[PDB]
Structure 1
Amino acid sequence: HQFGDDVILDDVQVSCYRTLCSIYSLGTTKNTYVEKLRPALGECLARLAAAMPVAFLEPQLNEYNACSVYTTKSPRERAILGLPNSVEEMCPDIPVLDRLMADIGGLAESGARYTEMPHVIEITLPMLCSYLPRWWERGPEAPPPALPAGAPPPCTAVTSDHLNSLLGNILRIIVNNLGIDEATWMKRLAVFAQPIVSRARPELLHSHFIPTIGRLRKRAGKVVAEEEQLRLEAKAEAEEGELLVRDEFSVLCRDLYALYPLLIRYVDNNRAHWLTEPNANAEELFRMVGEIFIYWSKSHNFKREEQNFVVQNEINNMSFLTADSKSKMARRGDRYSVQTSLIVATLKKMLPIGLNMCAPTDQDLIMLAKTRYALKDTDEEVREFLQNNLHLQGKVEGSPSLRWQMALYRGLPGREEDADDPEKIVRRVQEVSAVLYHLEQTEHPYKSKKAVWHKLLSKQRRRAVV
């Protein structure tokens, strides 16, 4: 409710400073008791940073802030209640934004694991995720009205570059701690990092997102290959190794539910551009998510471990999907649902990219490839099938709709008619058709009543079952 600038002014600032600076001091202490407490401390610290009206990380410019005790009060005050006489001394232990951001970047490039920098992940980064946006609003790059922009200097210096750097460093940290068995901090890091993704620049895609999803996709491919081998060889041993692959699925899904929620926001803020000016990196990311979703639909263990992760870890997923409206504040099925699943949601969001890849004429080939995939043909099989049935491409001369659709295809700057080639068309149709077919299966599985739980017969024979 944006009440901080009116509530925390004179002594509430002192109390909030003291709380903030003690909580930051915790970083030095290493103990068993601290470990369990750092999550809640970091959450409280984040909410304090979002609300607290001063910029304690940028004190040198506090002179320009009016919601500060040092400006509001006379120097003859602040002496009756012992104060350092300088904003910097209020608690110097907390570093400035520059130093803190530099330390985060250094750890990320070094490859530090969670154990080396646990204070950061659990306490510091959430605080920045709440600090940087609030002060980006009040600093330069903010929407300037004439007089407000020209009159008082901005206390803060936050720009979109700070947020982009922080997001990149966070992604680097996650990839460095990607394979580890125990990464309970990821779920919280994602929820804290979500807000700052809006300022994310386009270059972040190529710099960070593509390699992450590529590594994760490759791991999923290896695990499903092991699953196929374990099914190929079916013994009492098959019970063994299945535990292993389920563990791999659990850790993998943890990494996915950490990374995707940020990507969804990045897509929602760059889909318009990716569709107006086509982006090859966006298409590659679509291919990645499509492969992952295909593995998800094909594998029984992958899906069930995803569900288990979600239910045990109390992941909302509806928060991640609907946060924009929420942020702006203007039953097992309810807890987890396939449609709520991030794996399906990200793919649905990026599907427009893959359909933009496909020209309108290719729709007939897409339908045929869907039929073949329902016949359970392989990727190379559908490729050669469409290669031999390529002549069958749709013709605009027959229908008027294709005329204006193809006119728009021209209107796209990146598109050139001479660029289209048979191999491109067959590959493109293969990818989009596979994704759409598996998505149809997911949408209308008919999986219901597979294990009836109406238990009507048991309500009838209730005395007999006992």
Structure 2
Amino acid sequence: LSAASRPLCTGGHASNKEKEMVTSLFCKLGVLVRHLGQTLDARTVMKTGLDSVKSALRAFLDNAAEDLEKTMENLKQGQFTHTRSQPKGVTQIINYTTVALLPMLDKHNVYSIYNTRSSRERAALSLPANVEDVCPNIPSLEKLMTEIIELAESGIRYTQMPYMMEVVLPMLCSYMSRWWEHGPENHPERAEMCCTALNSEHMNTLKIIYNNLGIDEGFSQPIINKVKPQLLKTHFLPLMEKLKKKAAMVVSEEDHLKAEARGDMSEAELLILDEFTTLARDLYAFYPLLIRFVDYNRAKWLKEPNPYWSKSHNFKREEQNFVVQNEINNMSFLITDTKSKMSKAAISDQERKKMKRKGDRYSMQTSLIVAALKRL
């Protein structure tokens, strides 16, 4: 007997019955949301579906071939349905597990629900260009909020492999790709806790030759011909390399926006074009040396930049001077220690945070390189 999901397979039962019941229940009751046990079972199935299996990648890893595709599609469609409402049930963090279920990209030809969610996100895709009261969901308090930034950052993150369609790269994706690149200033609106929370997502095809062949493409995708993205994605690297200043606290977001597309994070043509791995990475590594080492720029503005033989000695010497300044500070604190609550404790915290971030960025790959060079 064919041990199908609903027929026999118990591993498929918990996915099939749960996802079918959700798609039957809350997809129907969403009209009941907008104006005894409906709310209770709703808040039940919310977190029973968001965390049916905490190992979301382990659930749909090799349990069934086609069931993972249908169930991830139905789950993301159910997420796209109720994304606009502003209810009390929070799932902005719980969407990260569902997003991580995708790369750990299947055949999306069975249905275009991902295209539906992408087109709903295309309402206000270009964030700073379209930031207004007509923002995503057209909200004042409904969906326009702080969670959408982290949702775009972590939830839109497919590091395994880009086996999707990517057919709207010249029109849909290029809209938020180009309106962002309309100027050097990012231009975020008020309540800008962080403008870099969109994502470290941009790469080479993942004005331009593909959109230039609008009738021809709209199948010569822009990812096929890598020269057209390689021209105008890399042209802006010298613009940011030129823009700088002596004062460090002025340019806070200068390193962040360049470090994503510049270095080896751009897997598209990293091994094809050696400039993306070599020269842009050298510039994006050398710029923080002049940027962060000044004491004017604080750690809170450039706290978490999670992402070379030449700049190694420069970092070592400048950090030696920085630790010498910290040691002179410690010798000052030992002699007549003033009120530590005012400026000394915060100064030690800032120095320790900067030194710890520098040591962690060394420990990513530069610590082993330093050990090998010291042995050499």
Structure with the higher fraction of residues in helix conformation: 1
Q: TM-score scaled by structure 2?
A: 0.44
Q: TM-score scaled by structure 1?
A: 0.37
Q: Which has the higher contact order (CA 8 A, sep 6+)?
A: 1
